[PDB]
Design a protein around this ligand. Structure first.
Ligand SMILES: Cc1cc(Cl)ccc1COc1ccnn1-c1cc(C(=O)O)ccn1
Ligand SMILES: O=C(O)CCC(=O)C(=O)O
Ligand SMILES: [Mn+2]
Length: 306
């Protein structure tokens, strides 16, 4: 059965340390860049409101067959009837799925059991589990989960500090320095359910990324430090399907699912974490990462530059 990787670093900044994100990330870099990912727990009283337009939040999530790679059928291409949800109806679907799957209330399922079952299902040819992921929804569509002082939605006085906070993902620096910048980006949202997942990838331009879980059940992460990027890529090339081996990285990353224990057996260092509601995850430049959701949740993410 699955062997959990060692835990990545978790930081609990004081209010003083919590003042500036880029200063804080710069200070923790000597350790966190050696693990690829780290988790940051804000001070206990730092609790931003949830500011999305919930009434109108509608989306068509994408369908994920956990074992699609292992399975490489009559009338393939039509495996699933298409479904549009609201935030509420997706959550009802997500909770019903998980409680039915495990035969217990959703919050009673141990995170280690969901993790073991996820990786079993990914390699299982005997059972096809299909889930849905509201992934990569633009914060321009229904707003960011953070309050934003753009005049589209009311901000209460006690919420203004969150609209102005440097840890608000809309206030992260995103402009890369370049000559072209002198001659010539917003956060993205992820509505998760149990087993919905993201496969191994790095960011465009080897960017940092930061990720905030607004609410819901945890998001389970795996990260690889940048010093092992080429090692991971070599294991991928050895073990990825031959048909996808020659593909450019930007396309291969759509289907680079791989059990962390396989990477660890080939000597790749892997760290894990459960990101809980109200916690940040930072990924460092060229740090490969992947993960899955434990249940119904809502995350926001952006690439930033230093
Ligand atoms: C297009 C897409 C579709 C699906 Cl089904 C899933 C993920 C994506 C893109 O995901 C990402 C792109 C760049 N980073 N990134 C990402 C996503 C998560 C997360 O899901 O929480 C975590 C960390 N990084
Ligand atoms: O596209 C997918 O389904 C995989 C998710 C992901 O993180 C990626 O595309 O690199
Ligand atoms: Mn990412």
């Amino acid at each position: 059965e699955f062997v959990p990787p060692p835990e990545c670093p978790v930081f609990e900044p004081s209010w003083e340390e919590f003042t500036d994100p880029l200063s804080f990330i710069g200070r923790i870099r000597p350790l966190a860049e050696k693990t690829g990912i780290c988790k940051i727990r804000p001070p206990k009283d730092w609790q931003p409101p949830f500011a999305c337009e919930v009434k109108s939040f509608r989306f068509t999530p994408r369908v994920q067959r956990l074992n699609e790679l292992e399975a490489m059928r009559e009338a393939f291409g039509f495996e699933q009837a298409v479904r549009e949800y609201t935030l509420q109806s997706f959550g009802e679907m997500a909770d019903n799925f998980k409680s039915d799957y495990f035969n217990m209330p959703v919050h009673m399922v141990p995170t280690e059991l969901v993790e073991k079952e996820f990786w079993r299902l990914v390699s299982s040819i005997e059972e096809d589990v299909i889930v849905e992921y509201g992934a990569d929804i633009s914060s321009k569509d229904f707003g960011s989960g953070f309050p934003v002082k753009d005049g589209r939605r009311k901000i209460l006085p006690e919420e203004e500090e969150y609209a102005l906070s440097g840890w608000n993902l809309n206030n992260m620096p995103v402009l890369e320095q370049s000559v072209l910048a002198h001659i010539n980006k917003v956060p993205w949202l992820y509505v998760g359910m149990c087993f919905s997942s993201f496969c191994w990838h790095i960011e465009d331009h080897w960017s940092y990324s930061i990720n905030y879980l607004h609410w819901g059940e945890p998001k389970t992460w795996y990260g690889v430090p940048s010093h092992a990027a080429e090692q991971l890529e070599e294991v991928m090339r050895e073990l990825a399907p031959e048909l996808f081996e020659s593909q450019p990285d930007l396309l291969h990353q759509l289907v680079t699912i791989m059990n962390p224990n396989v990477l660890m057996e080939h000597g790749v260092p892997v760290y894990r974490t459960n990101q809980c509601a109200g916690e940040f995850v930072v990924t460092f430049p060229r740090a490969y990462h992947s993960g899955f959701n434990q249940g119904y949740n809502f995350a926001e993410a952006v690439n930033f530059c230093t």
